[PDB]
Amino acid sequence: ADKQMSVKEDLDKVEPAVIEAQNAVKSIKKQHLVEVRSMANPPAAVKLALESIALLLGESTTDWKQIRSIIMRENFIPTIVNFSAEEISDAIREKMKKNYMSNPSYNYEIVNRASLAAGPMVKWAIAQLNYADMLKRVEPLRNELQKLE
Amino acid sequence: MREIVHIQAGQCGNQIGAKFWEVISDEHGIDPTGSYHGDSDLQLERINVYYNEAAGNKYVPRAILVDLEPGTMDSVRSGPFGQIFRPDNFVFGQSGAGNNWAKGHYTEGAELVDSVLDVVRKESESCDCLQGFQLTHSLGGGTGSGMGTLLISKIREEYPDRIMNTFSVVPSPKVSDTVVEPYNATLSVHQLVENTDETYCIDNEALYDICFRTLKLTTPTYGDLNHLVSATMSGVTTCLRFPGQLNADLRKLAVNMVPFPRLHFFMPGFAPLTSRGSQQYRALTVPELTQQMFDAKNMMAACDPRHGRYLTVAAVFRGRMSMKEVDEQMLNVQNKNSSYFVEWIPNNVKTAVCDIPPRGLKMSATFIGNSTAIQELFKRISEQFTAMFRRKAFLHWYTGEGMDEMEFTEAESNMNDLVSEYQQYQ
Amino acid sequence: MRECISIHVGQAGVQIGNACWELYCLEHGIQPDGQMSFNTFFSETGAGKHVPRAVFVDLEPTVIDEVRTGTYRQLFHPEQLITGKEDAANNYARGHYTIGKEIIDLVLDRIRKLADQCTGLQGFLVFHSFGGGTGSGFTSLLMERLSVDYGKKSKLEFSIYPAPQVSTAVVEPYNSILTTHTTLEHSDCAFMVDNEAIYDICRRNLDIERPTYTNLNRLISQIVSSITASLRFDGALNVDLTEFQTNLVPYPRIHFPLATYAPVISAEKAYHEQLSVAEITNACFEPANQMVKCDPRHGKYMACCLLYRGDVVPKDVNAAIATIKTKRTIQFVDWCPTGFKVGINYQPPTVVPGGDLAKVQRAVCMLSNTTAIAEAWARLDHKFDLMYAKRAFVHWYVGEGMEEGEFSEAREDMAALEKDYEEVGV
Ligand SMILES: CC(=O)O[C@H]1C(=O)[C@@]2(C)[C@H]([C@H](OC(=O)c3ccccc3)[C@]3(O)C[C@H](OC(=O)[C@H](O)[C@@H](NC(=O)c4ccccc4)c4ccccc4)C(C)=C1C3(C)C)[C@]1(OC(C)=O)CO[C@@H]1C[C@@H]2O
Ligand SMILES: Nc1nc2c(ncn2[C@@H]2O[C@H](COP(=O)(O)OP(=O)(O)OP(=O)(O)O)[C@@H](O)[C@H]2O)c(=O)[nH]1
Ligand SMILES: Nc1nc2c(ncn2[C@@H]2O[C@H](COP(=O)(O)OP(=O)(O)O)[C@@H](O)[C@H]2O)c(=O)[nH]1
Ligand SMILES: [Mg+2]
């Protein structure tokens, strides 16, 4: 019963993280999205910032002329609403971890300086790639809920 | 350089376009045969923008004509200026959209789009350097709304870095012409907001006002209404096509006119708007023109400007004038209408002075206003639409073409979003 | 010989240029044909023809196309006239980051070639506008490149500054500030003229009721002719470009002298006048005659220079200066007693056929620094703060290779500048 709550502590220690990461979903302006839709030759910082969320959904293309198409489409807004990294694959997340743990753009200072158009969404992308971490927090102990529970 | 690819979709689009071409043709000295017979070298200095030359001084608008029916575009051909088009540029099917957005976008027009896009692609590659795409397309029809909007989407995907401007003719709540005008407009707008850089919203009501009061034509022909909008578009694009003391690119206008990504809708005007023989009383001056332009009677939009404040203004004058006069004149104007200029933006107005008059008026002007007031136009349509959606009315025509209630709800959301933003920046 | 380079950038630059090269030709005695020591501004060709030592750049080909068809056409070798594809459209981020980082390299080439010609390359003159799209980013970019190349060379900046009242363009305020961020740390000296003040001068002193851009430009150009003629001509006390920099930059950061070119006198005002040396001095110091919208009495002239031309004799000048020093109204800075340099040149200004001015035997361009220009800075900072509170037109710039943080830093710089001037005044 002591270990029965320690395996239930994991959902509680990720509770501040999950809530704040899903608070980065709610802190989204409709105007800020379309600034990206109206941007043709962006800063290299904001370009990488959308490459962060490009492969989160699963688009390997990196050209700005070609990546603006996913941004341009109207599928892009509702998918950001309901999004969970719990269902996001580990392998792709690993690619999201490897690439984005090297980013100057991941530093909340570079994005903010570049634009406030990319500001809260990188604040989401840090929270959302850290939602991948919440997945990697809960899941290496979920096995304890499958055999030890 | 900086050439524009015209488009005309739906009877309305097709007809304004018809008259539009005729108008630009006269301005650049081109006759009905596609031959040049003009005395102004400046016409052929920058003919490029609006025409391709071929063998034997052949001239040809870079214009694509689209109609889901053949009829309206076959009338085009019969017309005097109709034979200036290279007939390969009329792309039509033979199933009418019949004032159904779903027929235009999803079904009948999805079949005819690919062919049209091929014609689009011809034109882009034939450009020294493509600037923009002008689409004259009604909002409230079938071939303007659905087919028009579908055309815009695909074109934006193909050339995202370029200008998309649409002189979109909108419903007038006081003179509705079609049943589901609300449906067509709402579905169109939801797409348009996201797919264009600038849209000049012209309703028939305002045109009538102009004709009746000022031009004193108490028998408006669609011809006359069209002649009006035509001149508007010519004025917009005069700078690209003629040398100037200060020259406003289409992009320049967009950049100067638009506070935010979204609120790109405009109200064009024109001056001098006078009847024949009502000009001898007048005398053409910069003040005169400005006064005419800033008057409500010379607005080609639904909204009364004074029911709101202009966010920005861009007055693209024509003919030979003193920059100083214009500057000094529009400074007075900023001051007088303190109530109807938004605070956010000092130097609200943006003057551009083309050095070319419109072949028969010693001076002229063209207004472009961005007013918070235009929220009212959207309100009217939102209201009209909403009530009918309450009874799920006419639904069967659209559900039949694959469209869904949730879509409509989302279109309503779009409308609501547009009106709230204007309220915020009131 | 001491020899120079011209760089006209942006519509304004080139338009100013059109005026400038007319003047020089009329002075040195060159026809538009190029047929006839002018070494400074004309480089002699193989035989007979003389070629202007100039660079003519614009992204808007419209402007320089007018150049290529004007009577001033065959004067310039078309090595000079560079063209770009599309205009900067009042975006600093298109002038600098996009269309700039494309055509800049070609321009750097032409510059280098011209530099090779010059035996004794004195320096540069950069006609641009703080508040056009071209001249706001592109100018800064060009300046940067030249600094990297030469460094030690003289660089001068005839900057059409925003008139606090008069309106051209909505984003105008943003552009200036970005330019300032970058310009002030390259150009060792920057003579800034706004159009409104020039218009004032046009209306009052010349009695002209229609101030065209042409006329406004001829005046600006006559400011530059006087600055040069010390190089271009013989005479006692001859000044050099380096001399100004050394004279009129009390602290290495602050270098924004105002300019006034008296007499500004019409065909009438020639009679009812005698045009004495000391008359013209007083006129120059007049609060109304400043070529900026700045009142010089709202601070202290830090250090002043006066470039008399034609039949000017030194002592007369010296007595007028005594008088000027005497007047306690016209405040000077405590810490430098004698704040003048006088250059007297035997060449008088020669006036353009079909123009504002009549043959004034004596003339003087006073290039005076003042702490009083801090008023025009503040105004502009305010205009920018107001629009950047709403973050308006943000989207245009950002999406063109810019930083939001760049906007913030620019203001910081302005604050620092203002603070420095305050210190100096104290
Ligand atoms: C001597 C004189 O003043 O003649 C004018 C005239 O009397 C008035 C009434 C003209 C006249 O305009 C109209 O009749 C009209 C009717 C409905 C909608 C718009 C115009 C004119 O017909 C129209 C005509 O316009 C032109 O010639 C322009 O080039 C115009 N294009 C055409 O009219 C045109 C007609 C057929 C085929 C091709 C072009 C234009 C305007 C702006 C931009 C591009 C082109 C002009 C100057 C006049 C008349 C003949 C009376 C006015 O319009 C124009 C465009 O000039 C009406 O408002 C002005 C005020 C003018 O005073
Ligand atoms: N003196 C003078 N100033 C001008 C002239 N034309 C424009 N200006 C000024 O220049 C600014 C307006 O922008 P422009 O200089 O025309 O723009 P640009 O540098 O050509 O940039 P783009 O139009 O984007 O290519 C304002 O300060 C105008 O007052 C002109 O002929 N003479
Ligand atoms: N200004 C103008 N409007 C027109 C013209 N013809 C039709 N319209 C408007 O177009 C609207 C109907 O759309 P329409 O494009 O005809 O439908 P479609 O034929 O199915 O494309 C109506 O509100 C008419 O007022 C015209 O020649 N000029
Ligand atoms: Mg220009």
Residue numbers in the entry:
A (entry chain C): 3270 to 3418
B (entry chain B): 1 to 426
C (entry chain A): 1 to 36, 48 to 437
Passage from the reporting paper:
The dynein family is a group of minus-end directed microtubule motors. Nucleotide-dependent conformational changes are transmitted to the MTBD through the stalk to modulate its affinity for microtubules, allowing dynein to bind and release as it steps along the microtubule.
Regions of the MTBD close to the microtubule were of sufficient resolution to see the pitch of alpha helices. We built and refined a new model of the high-affinity form of the MTBD using the low-affinity MTBD crystal structure as a starting point. The major movement involves H1 and CC1, which move together to occupy the intra-dimer cleft above α- and β-tubulin. A more minor change is seen in H6 in order to accommodate its interaction with α-tubulin. The only significant conformational change that occurs upon binding is the movement of H1 upwards to accommodate the change in stalk registry. The MTBD interface made up of H2, H3, H4 and H6 shows only minor changes upon microtubule binding, suggesting it is in a binding-primed conformation regardless of nucleotide state. When the motor switches to a high microtubule affinity nucleotide state, H1 moves up and the MTBD can be further stabilised on the microtubule by interactions between H1 and β-tubulin.
